[PDB]
């Protein structure tokens, strides 16, 4: 999976 907001990334 991609990392996004919920995984602390922007």
């Amino acid at each position: 999976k991609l990392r996004g907001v919920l995984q602390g990334h922007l």
Partner: antibody
Amino acid sequence: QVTLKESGPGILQPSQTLSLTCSFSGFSLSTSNMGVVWIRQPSGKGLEWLLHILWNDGKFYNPALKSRLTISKDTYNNQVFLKIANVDTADTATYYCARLFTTTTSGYFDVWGAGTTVTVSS
Amino acid sequence: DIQMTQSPASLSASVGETVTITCRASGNIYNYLAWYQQKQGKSPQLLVYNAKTLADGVPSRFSGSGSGTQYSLKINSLQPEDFGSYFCQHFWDTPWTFGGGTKLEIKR
């Protein structure tokens, strides 16, 4: 020449506000995929993620501490400012800032500061 | 929340030995696991990211492996500089969480 250096008060009495500064060079907080993270480690114990601030001013917090946490960045002077409000004795630890490299397909702290020691007591 | 369970807490070994440290996440983390190495009294350095990608400066006798919730760090033929502490850490759902650490210590 990516470098980071924590600064702080060293000793603090309980109920006070801990102010920590991270001064960095060799990278910019105006470049994407970059962030600064704070991590702490009580002497002889494990590591704990506190929070991070990103190049685009995104901020993320440990929920256990999020109520007491504040972070900002001064991108022109290459500094990140951390505040922990109302410290108790359990906030006694070594504090690290480190560069966060973050993308949609990876994450890691590849360069850390040497750490700064913080003691909370009366 | 998403917890890292690292074992063993302590491991005695000899130079030349091959050892393996394990880390279990309480939920799928999609290979987003870093390993850090910490010398006594020092700031931790990055060894491995995305579970199996070696960081710069790191010899091939280190390898990572695993998926889902089960990950491990393996050190082939330990060398003196390898003694110290090792921590895993995930980069999936916040809060990010570190393993409790493994002390790699000298057998005698």
